[PDB]
Design a protein around this ligand. Sequence first.
Ligand SMILES: [Mg+2]
Ligand SMILES: [Mg+2]
Ligand SMILES: [Mg+2]
Ligand SMILES: [Mg+2]
Ligand SMILES: [Mg+2]
Ligand SMILES: [Mg+2]
Ligand SMILES: [Mg+2]
Ligand SMILES: [Mg+2]
Lengths: 357, 357, 357, 357
Amino acid sequence: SWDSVVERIRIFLVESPIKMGSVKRVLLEVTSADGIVGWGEAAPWTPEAAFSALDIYLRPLILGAPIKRVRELMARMDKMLVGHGEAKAAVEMALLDILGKATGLSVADLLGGRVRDRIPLSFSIADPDFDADLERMRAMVPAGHTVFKMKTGVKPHAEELRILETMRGEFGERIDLRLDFNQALTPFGAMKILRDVDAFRPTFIEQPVPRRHLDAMAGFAAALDTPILADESCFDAVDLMEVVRRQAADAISVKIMKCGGLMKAQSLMAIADTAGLPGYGGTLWEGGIALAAGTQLIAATPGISLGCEFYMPHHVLTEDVLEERIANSAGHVIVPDGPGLGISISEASLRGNAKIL
Amino acid sequence: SWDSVVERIRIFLVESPIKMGSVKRVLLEVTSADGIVGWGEAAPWTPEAAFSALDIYLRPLILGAPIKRVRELMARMDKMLVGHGEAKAAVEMALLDILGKATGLSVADLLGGRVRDRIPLSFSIADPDFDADLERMRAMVPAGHTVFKMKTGVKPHAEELRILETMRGEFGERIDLRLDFNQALTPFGAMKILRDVDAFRPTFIEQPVPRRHLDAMAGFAAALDTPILADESCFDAVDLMEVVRRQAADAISVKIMKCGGLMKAQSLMAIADTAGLPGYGGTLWEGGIALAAGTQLIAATPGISLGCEFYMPHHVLTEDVLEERIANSAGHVIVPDGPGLGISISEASLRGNAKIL
Amino acid sequence: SWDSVVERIRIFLVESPIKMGSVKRVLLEVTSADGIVGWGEAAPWTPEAAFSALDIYLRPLILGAPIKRVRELMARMDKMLVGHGEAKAAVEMALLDILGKATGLSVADLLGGRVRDRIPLSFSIADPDFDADLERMRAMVPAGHTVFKMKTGVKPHAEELRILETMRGEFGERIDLRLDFNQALTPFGAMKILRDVDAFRPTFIEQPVPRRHLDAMAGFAAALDTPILADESCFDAVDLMEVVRRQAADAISVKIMKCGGLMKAQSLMAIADTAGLPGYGGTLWEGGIALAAGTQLIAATPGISLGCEFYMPHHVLTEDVLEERIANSAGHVIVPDGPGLGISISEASLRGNAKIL
Amino acid sequence: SWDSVVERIRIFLVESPIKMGSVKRVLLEVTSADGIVGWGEAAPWTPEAAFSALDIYLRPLILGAPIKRVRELMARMDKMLVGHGEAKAAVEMALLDILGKATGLSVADLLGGRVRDRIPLSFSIADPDFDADLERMRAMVPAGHTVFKMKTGVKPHAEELRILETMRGEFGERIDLRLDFNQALTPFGAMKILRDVDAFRPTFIEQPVPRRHLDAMAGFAAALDTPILADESCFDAVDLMEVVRRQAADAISVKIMKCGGLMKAQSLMAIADTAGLPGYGGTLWEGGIALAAGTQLIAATPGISLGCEFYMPHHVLTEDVLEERIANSAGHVIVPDGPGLGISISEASLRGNAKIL
Ligand SMILES: [Mg+2]
Ligand SMILES: [Mg+2]
Ligand SMILES: [Mg+2]
Ligand SMILES: [Mg+2]
Ligand SMILES: [Mg+2]
Ligand SMILES: [Mg+2]
Ligand SMILES: [Mg+2]
Ligand SMILES: [Mg+2]
């Protein structure tokens, strides 16, 4: 029978290299009274904000807290501080890492158990040189990649239509093709654009207009066969209840840190499953600790059936603090095996692959 | 790192004594490939139904199943069989018992952790001789009982009003008083009745009319300050979404087996928390195994904040198959400590306290 | 630190020449206690009405009023007199002209600052001889005109369709083509007409039916991809809230004097921006003073993004009282530079270019 | 004719003393190419967040920007950065300070002109020792204080009722009494509480339940004569449109920095005026620069007719960087006179009254 309390934390502001460059990351190391270590990462969606949140506001809540009572601590952190979802999620992550390691269970195991072992990984089609992208697809489809997301509303509409025509002409339904307008359309004049791309039967169209325009989003969903997916229209459980009530979307992207962590993401998905709205894992931060957390969540959350994608594939994380990277192959992320988050971090791996501020 | 599969089951039809008499109960014993035993109980809300369900329909799904993948198995059982929520919940119960014992965790721990250690237990006020009941209250309030539920719509309305007047005159707000009409009112003529008892400010009024009359229930909630609690109007997540949409209740009773188990009850409560509807634990079956399951659920589910009550207090379970009983004292159930469900069952305890059919 | 009061006014009823002729215009000259002069113009949408309004009803409100407190004076004029929006707007115009000249600021500057320096100017296509119009377009598109508005519902529907076909055949999307039915359609039988012209993807269709038929207008908007623009359905902020609530239009034309002035037009557009409805500057009166006011407003009001047009291009204002005309070139009005309204009016310019009644 | 660009900024993180202690504040000094200085302050509702926002994200937008084009710059800052409303509002504040000083106009003048010269200031009644508070009221009412806000839902309901009875017994309608539950009620059981305090006819009841529960808030408003005021339910124009649509409140508190600045607050109030919802100035930060901004806004925004209050009166700002403090007397804030914000800050006043980090 395992019971133990948090004994100390270390908060690290680290710099990590990318190539498209630098990015800063907040990592939290929690250590129990019986010696077991767990890691969390606060990924924004300003790292100084998160960094201070943990160091001053949340520190006296973490310290002493019983590690088996994660939901209880999250309710304490939400009562004392308002809306630092990223920092709170790093604490939850780390406590679940510890609890998992102490009991021989993964985080997925502690969230109802795995329902899948791999997660479809979307490949972004966003190259100004479409021919460059076509050859990538030409190699990737035979290698088992099926999920592609085309950035749309960037080139003249006619050109984007010819591109979609070329893609459906070669691949037909062998690709699971999604479109993303990145909120760039206005409700005025969006419908002719959306109706044109709806003829190619994309699996979904992501958030064509900004967060406010729920009636416009409901209008699109009502007129179009193609599923409309809410991203910025749905951050949390409250937004989701309004999306359902207005029928403003057919699917939602789940943002572990926008919604406020792993348990909150599963609560969100209970609503969505009842309402018949599939979830998409959204943009996962490539930082190994936050990515491990997201992969475990999705592994244990059957309604998140639309796969996932990386924060911005066009700039890849070159060195990380994990002893071993979370792996992807043939169009899917491999859900790391092993207790807790299923990752390891040593002093050397940390202080030798990131510059500590 | 623990991983193991179900290796065998035994299904027992048992007779157990009561005093107001006999009742029949379906108990399931599951045993893993690494020797660890877990128990579940199917409590109706006909035991032959449940008994056959486990023995023929569900047996080939249980056998071989990985015990860490509880949600995955529940999705298999719902796909292959429709609407035997009781039998499926006994399987889940037992797998969580095993998983808990294998890892040193309670079932609450595996459901996000405890958020409470005791559960307020409602005392039913239903004696035709009210003076008998008044003396009971006279002793119980000083002993720490606060929660009382009066059965109403049984004696002439005037008499029930004089009773409520006597109760508020002595106790005021020192008692948390609830009323239950047991669906006995009709939508025609209910409002004058309900308005009269609303003046005594009960904590809630339970399901005054049958399940169908959601508009009537919404009508009551709209006219009355007193919270209306849905019982038979809300069995599952689907009912709850309609209750929210119609604003047909202010609170719901959660039926672990009506809704389809422990994880389904927590999904139900994610919807209810977002919607601002508190949960009540409803009528818990006194059979020790099902009661342990219900107590763990409520221990780990913060939105179920209205306490609980026993199936029918007027007939108490005289001997049970547990080595030690789940305990209540001073108006609350004590959430049993220890791994899994936190109960033990030996061959002797089973075959010497229940008659096996 | 500038502070000053209105010291006197002169109200002028003037006759001005046109060619298709005469029109009468109400001009107001306000003069501060520190000598600075400002002009306003009341443009109907009977000039005797406006003329008396200023001379008797509003005169005792203007006189003495602090010129820095424009919104305060407008609230006084709305409290004492009901619904002479034109005359009140001339007072506001003039006070902002004075305030601007006193401080070295334009009217746009006093309304949050310019967000644009030119305003797209719509060219009306309304010639019975379409070939005459086609040659005009043939010259104007290469000269930088993009915005065209076709009067529709005037020639037999078949002929209007062949015209639209010829226009899209030559110009494609190189023209921003709008259609205007001038309220001539009835809700009975409008939808087949509107669906036919919707295939040519006009940028918007203006007020196909009269003001009353908001459900009909909402019906059109719901069935058609093409934006429906409200004109006579939306005069003021109150109408706009109902248009939004009923989703009766996708865009609105803002009538500076119908809505009750420059500040009221910006309040109207705050609602419309939140609701995702772009504004169109509507029909601007060519009288230089009112036109300067409208151009400043639009310059400072980013949501009015659909351009503007002149009251009736088929009859042009031949001589005006401005020392220099507001200029348009290559399909856009040039927002006049300089303090206040950015226009000048001398005794000679006034008494030598208009006949004073 | 004045035109000029921003030439440089200085961002200061300062510590300021209070007494109930320390607080940190972000102050921004902007300087034009023609030498004129303006100040802004970012008041949270973590100062490191705001501090970095200005220094790295917003700095290249501010530098070079034309000071007459405030709305244009705000649209640039909202396009490049998402949701740092505090930091953006400090930039707007400072540019309006400069523009005002350059032209001899106050910020109110640039926002349509003053409509009032004083702002009713609410006095918080929150002392556990009510008798202490009663004597304060006894002195303050004869001195001209009329506006009082009682914190409610803190002492037992019965005691709060006796307090309200004593207050109405002495003062009757000579006090403008407001109640604030600080979101402490739950939708379950709130109505009996609210109905009890509604009998004392408070001017309004502020946000009795958390932000999510809009249907509950609409329920309260529908059942009660007393106005319900939205605070956390209404941050911005988008929330307000939903509040209006659901009729979830009768009045709103306007948060200059929650809504995203001074112009955004006036846009918000155009919606609210049309909808018949009065505004309340909410909790103003006592830091002199942010307070000057809030006072100018309210001075120029007639719909904010419910007065204002200070962030937390129980801890007063002991020394500030203003040469002279914004003044209050006899229950009202005096809107500071003079160009721009109407405040001055020297090197000595700044570096001698706050500790610079
Ligand atoms: Mg659809
Ligand atoms: Mg997105
Ligand atoms: Mg009610
Ligand atoms: Mg019941
Ligand atoms: Mg439409
Ligand atoms: Mg028109
Ligand atoms: Mg009301
Ligand atoms: Mg508040």
